[PDB]
Write a protein that binds this ligand. Structure first.
Ligand code: A1H2Y
Length: 262
């Protein structure tokens, strides 16, 4: 799992940045070829968090999730991942309002397949949103950003926290309980974002105003040009009572069926 720093070449430019530090593009020397990578570099609390993130990614193996190549302990701690060249889905759609409905359905279906896998594997993502889906190509999405993610214990169906409120289900806010069904709620917000071309959800509202709106049974409206069936699926993801909300098996099947007849 530990990579050799001498086999990594970084670019100077940064792709992004935050309290942890920076994300830069680089190249990792393999047997013959070089592999383009995205490298999360700590400008260092922070250590354990990066190590926990890599620990999650190390356990996942699925085409619609960002793969970890390894960790590099060098001038800084570095989490080396396969590169998603086109970057975050929200930003991509904000810059490319031409993308067709059918292409959006294809991408959100790919996210649902990743998430179905994540749910089967008993991990909760806890930060599922359009900014955390990355594009390989205009037709290939991957789930990223496993910093808040939790491996559920073998005999528990949720994680009790001890916040991206606009993406959180009522049971997360009210009871601090995070399940695969909480991620389904998030997935519905992600779908709304995708069909809105990377607009922000609940525009202009405080977290507490969002919670009140939801408790009145109010939900965001159908984005322009979003198909009825896809809005109906969003509303099903925003099922208030977690017990009655679909899991990702049911969500992925709905998307699959709709895509393969649209
Ligand atoms: C071409 O432009 C871009 C390409 C890429 N590609 C690409 N590929 C594979 C992996 C990753 C990647 C980025 C991050 C990350 O930590 N992002 C920070 C800024 C925000 N997170 C929210 C909590 C931390 N992680 C965990 N994985 N990124 C990314 C671009 O981020 C803005 C931009």
């Amino acid at each position: 799992v530990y990579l050799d720093r001498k086999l990594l070449t970084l670019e100077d430019k940064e792709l992004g940045s935050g309290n942890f530090g920076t994300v830069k593009k680089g190249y990792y020397q393999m047997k013959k070829v070089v592999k383009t990578v995205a490298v999360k570099i700590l400008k260092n609390a922070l250590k354990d968090e990066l190590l926990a993130e890599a620990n999650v990614m190390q356990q996942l193996d699925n085409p619609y999730i960002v793969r970890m190549i390894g960790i590099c302990e060098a001038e800084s701690w570095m989490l080396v991942m396969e590169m998603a060249e086109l970057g975050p889905l929200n930003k991509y759609l904000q810059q490319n309002r031409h993308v067709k409905d059918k292409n959006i359905i294809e991408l959100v279906h790919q996210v649902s397949m990743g998430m179905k896998y994540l749910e089967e594997s008993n991990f909760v993502h806890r930060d599922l949103a359009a900014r955390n889906v990355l594009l390989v190509t205009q037709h290939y999405a991957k789930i990223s950003d496993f910093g808040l993610s939790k491996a559920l214990r073998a005999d528990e169906n949720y994680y009790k926290a001890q916040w991206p409120v606009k993406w959180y289900a009522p049971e997360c806010i009210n009871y601090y309980k995070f399940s695969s069904k909480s991620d389904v709620w998030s997935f519905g917000v992600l779908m709304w974002e995708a069909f809105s071309y990377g607009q922000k959800p609940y525009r202009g509202m405080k977290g507490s105003e969002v919670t009140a709106m939801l408790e009145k049974g109010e939900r965001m409206g159908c984005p322009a040009g979003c198909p009825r069936e896809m809005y109906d699926l969003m509303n099903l993801c925003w099922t208030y009572d977690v017990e009655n909300r679909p899991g990702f098996a049911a969500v992925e099947l709905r998307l699959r069926n709709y895509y393969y007849d649209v």
